[PDB]
Amino acid sequence: RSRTFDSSDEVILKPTGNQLTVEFLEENSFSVPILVLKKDGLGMTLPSPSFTVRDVEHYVGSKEIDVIDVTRQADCKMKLGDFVKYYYSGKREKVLNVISLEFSDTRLSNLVETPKIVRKLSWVENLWPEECVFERPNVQKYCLMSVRDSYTDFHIDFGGTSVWYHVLKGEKIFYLIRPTNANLTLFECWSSSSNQNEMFFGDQVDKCYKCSVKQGQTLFIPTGWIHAVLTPVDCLAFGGNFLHSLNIEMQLKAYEIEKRLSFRFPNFETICWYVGKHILDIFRGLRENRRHPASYLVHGGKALNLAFRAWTRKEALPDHEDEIPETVRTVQLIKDLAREIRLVEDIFQ
Ligand SMILES: [Fe+2]
Numbered sequence: 001r002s003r004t005f006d007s008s009d010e011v012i013l014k015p016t017g018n019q020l021t022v023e024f025l026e027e028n029s030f031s032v033p034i035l036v037l038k039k040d041g042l043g044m045t046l047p048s049p050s051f052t053v054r055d056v057e058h059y060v061g062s063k064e065i066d067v068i069d070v071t072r073q074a075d076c077k078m079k080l081g082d083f084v085k086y087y088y089s090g091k092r093e094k095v096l097n098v099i100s101l102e103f104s105d106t107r108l109s110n111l112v113e114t115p116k117i118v119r120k121l122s123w124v125e126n127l128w129p130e131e132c133v134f135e136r137p138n139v140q141k142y143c144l145m146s147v148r149d150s151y152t153d154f155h156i157d158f159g160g161t162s163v164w165y166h167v168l169k170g171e172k173i174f175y176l177i178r179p180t181n182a183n184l185t186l187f188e189c190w191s192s193s194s195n196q197n198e199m200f201f202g203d204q205v206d207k208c209y210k211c212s213v214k215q216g217q218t219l220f221i222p223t224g225w226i227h228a229v230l231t232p233v234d235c236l237a238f239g240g241n242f243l244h245s246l247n248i249e250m251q252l253k254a255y256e257i258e259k260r261l262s263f264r265f266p267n268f269e270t271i272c273w274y275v276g277k278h279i280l281d282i283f284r285g286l287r288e289n290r291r292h293p294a295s296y297l298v299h300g301g302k303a304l305n306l307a308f309r310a311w312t313r314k315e316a317l318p319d320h321e322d323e324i325p326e327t328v329r330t331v332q333l334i335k336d337l338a339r340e341i342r343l344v345e346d347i348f349q
Pocket of ligand 1: 155156157227
């Protein structure tokens with residue numbers, strides 16, 4: 001069914017759970033996917049490997065879940081009970097898939113706890129305010145249910161998020177392409193092309209990696225990585241998406257690609273504004289303590305401020321104002337971030 005791909009074991013890091021720390025990611029900038037073979041040390045809480053799709057139906061209830069018909073490349077709404085009924089059907093007609101069942105507001109929500117590293121890095125988890133007019137983005141806990149021969153074409157995850165993905169049962173195969181400027185250009189071209197779902201994108205790039213994720217294993221995909229997924233065995237997985245401060249330019253690049261392409265990280269800009277205010281404080285506090293900020297934070301801080309100026313230009317503002325929180329003074333924030341960055345970069349002190 002498939003083709004021949006490049007060796008994942010040449011690019012993909014395989015640390016233990018305990019080795020996967022913030023400092024570990026700060027050293028490599030989280031540039032490559034990370035496969036942890038054994039969940040020990042990841043800080044997760046999971047149901048038993050005996051846990052099944054039938055077991056899921058118990059907690060979420062038979063709630064209208066969104067399902068993807070891969071066969072006819074179409075999306076539709078169906079009851080969860082009926083999906084399970086199709087799932088355990090020994091004569092499967094269609095090839096249906098669930099990759100959008102976000103369950104953090106359900107009863108299942110207290111059975112799963114995401115990786116520790118994800119909660120430490122996550123913008124929403126750490127920096128989204130208790131009180132504001134906006135709905136909190138809840139994209140941290142998805143229950144994924146895929147049948148044999150399920151596929152998702154090459155894509156970048158919404159909002160330029162990073163992903164974590166734990167296979168509880170079965171297997172998933174990821175086809176992974178690095179988000180270089182060239183690949184991203186080739187990708188944006190291929191995506192907005194007419195009859196996009198005819199051409200195979202992994203042929204267009206220098207390198208495409210095949211990564212198998214088997215039972216008990218956890219994959220972390222960094223910002224902007226282009227990936228397709230094959231399900232060669234019926235799969236039950238848990239996973240989710242998050243933003244962080246290690247590759248802010250990449251997050252903004254990825255975000256703005258889906259802008260030009262025209263499913264979405266809700267209030268993406270809103271969280272950036274809050275993060276900009278936080279990053280301003282980190283800078284101030286570090287300067288007053290005679291300490292220099294990490295290099296990636298300066299880079300990211302600059303990329304953030306560039307986006308802030310672009311969103312707040314006269315010609316752009318109407319498309320962006322509704323995401324600016326009232327608790328943020330735009331011009332002052334931009335001015336203050338710029339000064340702190342200049343002070344760190346100005347060679348005369
Ligand atoms: Fe994805």
